[PDB]
Amino acid sequence: MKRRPRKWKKKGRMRWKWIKKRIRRLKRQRKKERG
Amino acid sequence: DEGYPAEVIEIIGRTGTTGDVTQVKVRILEGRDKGRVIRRNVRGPVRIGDILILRETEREAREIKS
Amino acid sequence: KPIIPMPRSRFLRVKCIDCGNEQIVFSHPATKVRCLICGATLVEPTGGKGIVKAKILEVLE
Amino acid sequence: DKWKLKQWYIIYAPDFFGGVEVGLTPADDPEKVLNRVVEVTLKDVTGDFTKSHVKLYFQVYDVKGQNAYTKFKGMKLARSYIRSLVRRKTTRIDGIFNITTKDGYKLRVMAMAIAMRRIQTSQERAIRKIMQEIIYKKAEELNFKDFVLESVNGKIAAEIAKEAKKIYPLRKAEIRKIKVLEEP
Amino acid sequence: KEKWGIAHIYSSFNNTIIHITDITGAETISRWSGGMVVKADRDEPSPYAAMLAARRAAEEALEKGIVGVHIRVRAPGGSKSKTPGPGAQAAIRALARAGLKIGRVEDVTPIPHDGTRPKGGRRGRRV
RNA sequence: GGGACCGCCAGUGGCGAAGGCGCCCGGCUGGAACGGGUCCGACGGUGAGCGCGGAAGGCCAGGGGAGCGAACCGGAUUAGAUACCCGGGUAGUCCUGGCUGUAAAGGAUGCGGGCUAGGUGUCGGGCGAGCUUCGAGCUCGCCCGGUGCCGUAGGGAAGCCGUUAAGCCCGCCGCCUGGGGAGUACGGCCGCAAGGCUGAAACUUAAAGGAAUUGGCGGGGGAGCACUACAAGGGGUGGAGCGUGCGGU
């Protein structure tokens, strides 16, 4: 979890904060159903 | 008709949105503020020394901000 | 900038006022300077040149 | 209506303020007049317009018939005046002190100093300490009323500036506000 | 003896209130808001509602033995705005013009040294 | 009565290793620069492994809960409102003890030494002149350190930088090797948890990206124009019939 500054330029992109948070929610649910 | 005539002396400059209102300085020629100089507006053409009639002397216009 | 550093501090042959005592003292003392016999102070340390009070007789380098 | 049921009681300034007359208040009962604050200006009491900024609050406490006699709640300088004094590239030095007078009148006074330019903090500490000790002294030697008047004319501020010259010149020294906390 | 009262002229950007009280400010004499004189809430802070209401309160005070008045201008103060509304000047002129002898005209907006966090959130009232 | 917070003074002040640090007094402690080499004698520089404190927010236990305000509850706006505006309102924001080790923590500039035209200010220490109501209290020159701004040579794609280097040499550490896939999968270790610290591959792509030039555009900013605009003033179209055109049949 070492975020690339390049990804923060909103050109052709969604705001990086929210993509990070989405990945985190996905992480949550996956680790949950694993155990 | 409680009016008060006053004498124009100096013209401050065209005022209002469209410049059709002209700002002048007028001296109250009669009333409770005799001789007092007030900045007052004029719709329609005006010159120096016109006698303009006031309903209220107390009203005043803000200084023209450039 | 001077190539060889030369000290801005000289030494002072001085005469004390009270007991007539000669002494060699420093221009920028880091501490107090007092006389041998009467004991009174001679030069006060400060941020720079010490505060002389007695009479300077000669300037040594 | 009620307003006809009111009657006017005259107020009287404190005796040490020359016992001047200032104004009247309408009350439906005398009991509603006690502990009534009145805000006056020293130009009114002494007539001196030069010190118009200073204001005195009098808590009205004594009613004999129609007449009202008061106590000296406190003093405040005019906020506009203080604002005018304060300027950029200048220091503001505020000294707050509780104090007992010679006659047991307990008090809070805070005092004001401003210099021409920006000064070192330690010098401000020295200013505070010197003014502190001076006001302690004047409290010791002087009683309530005389000390109050002595503060009113500001000559305390004058001697304060005189002694504070020995640390840094002052654009103006003064006593911003005074609150008689309680009586003996 | 000439009678002097206190005219508290509160002015926000939504309303103006003119309250006339005795020299101690402990007894009410005349208290007229902007709402008394207009029928649109938007019109309450306008200078006309101000001067009309002010004149009404002024004549009422005159009828009750008042002649002189000390004006006390007030902005909302606190964490709220500090500039008096546009109607305060109009109301002061009206009180002068209603036959009241005007004395001290000062501001009494309570200015805080260090006040609560104001309203609206961190990014401001995002109009 | 209560809880927070300490205005103007505040500045291109100060201090701090960094995030960060401002009400007054007294105490305790940490240091730094300046002036004196009085001392030691290379005792150094850097740092893989290690260790420390470390903004907001979150979390565990207890207290506290003025205002503000995540969630939530209403009012309004709208085609729609899960928002923007408004009325409230929980966790939070405060104190105590512990955890969590994160940010545009950005000068987007790892640190130490030697060299290198200048101009100028403030900050602070020292020195020398001038002023003095005699307080290093006020003006000027210099030296040192920090902090800008301008700037020669010089650099660099350019933006720009330029003795506070991003120029030239010496010492050490880390990091980087087209773009997505991805800070993901698996695994390890840590943390009560949310998470943290390490971390690929397949496959897919001719660009991605950086600086500046011109035009264009701005529900940006200034200046100036009046008639295909507007303010003053003024006529009349659209309602009825016809001439004639365009669409329609």
Swiss-Prot record, chain A:
Keywords (A to Z) from UniProt: Ribonucleoprotein, Ribosomal protein
Keyword Ribosomal protein tagged: yes
GO cellular component annotations of the record: ribonucleoprotein complex; ribosome
Subunit structure: Part of the small ribosomal subunit.
Miscellaneous field: Initially thought to be part of the large ribosomal subunit. Crystal structures show eS32/eL41 to be a small ribosomal subunit forming a bridge at the interface of the 2 subunits.
Entry's family note: Belongs to the eukaryotic ribosomal protein eS32 family.
Protein name in the entry: Small ribosomal subunit protein eS32
Swiss-Prot record, chain C:
Phylogenetic placement of the source organism: Archaea, Methanobacteriati, Methanobacteriota, Thermococci, Thermococcales
Xref: Pfam families: Ribosomal_S27e
PROSITE patterns noted in UniProt: RIBOSOMAL_S27E
Entry binding sites for Zn(2+): C16, C19, C35, C38
Gene Ontology biological process terms in this record: translation
Zinc fingers (C4-type) by residue: 16-38
Molecular function terms, GO-annotated: structural constituent of ribosome; zinc ion binding
GO CC term, one of those recorded: ribonucleoprotein complex
This protein's encoding gene: rps27e
Cofactor: Zn(2+)
Quaternary structure, from the entry: Part of the 30S ribosomal subunit.
Record family assignment: Belongs to the eukaryotic ribosomal protein eS27 family.
Cofactor binding comment, as recorded: Binds 1 zinc ion per subunit.
UniProt entry keywords in alphabetical sequence: Metal-binding, Ribonucleoprotein, Ribosomal protein, Zinc, Zinc-finger
Name used for this protein in its record: Small ribosomal subunit protein eS27
UniProtKB/Swiss-Prot annotation, chain D:
InterPro entries in UniProt: Ribosomal_eS1, Ribosomal_eS1_arc, Ribosomal_eS1_CS
Organism of derivation: Pyrococcus furiosus (strain ATCC 43587 / DSM 3638 / JCM 8422 / Vc1)
The name this protein goes by in its record: Small ribosomal subunit protein eS1
Keyword tags: Ribonucleoprotein, Ribosomal protein
PANTHER family: 40S RIBOSOMAL PROTEIN S3A (PTHR11830)
Disulfide bonds: none
Top-level taxon of origin: Archaea
Keyword Ribosomal protein applies: yes
From Swiss-Prot, chain E:
GO CC entries: ribonucleoprotein complex; ribosome
Residue ranges of the TM segments: none
NCBIfam families: arch_S11P (TIGR03628), PRK09607.1 (NF007176)
Description of how the protein assembles with itself and partners: Part of the 30S ribosomal subunit.
Gene3D superfamilies xrefs: Ribosomal protein S11
Family: Belongs to the universal ribosomal protein uS11 family.
Classification via Pfam families: Ribosomal_S11 (PF00411)
Function according to Swiss-Prot or TrEMBL: Located on the platform of the 30S subunit.
Protein name: Small ribosomal subunit protein uS11
Region (Disordered): 106-127
HAMAP family, A to Z: Ribosomal_uS11
Stretches assigned to coiled coil: none
GO MF term list: rRNA binding; structural constituent of ribosome
Keywords tagged on the record: Ribonucleoprotein, Ribosomal protein, RNA-binding, rRNA-binding
GO biological process: translation
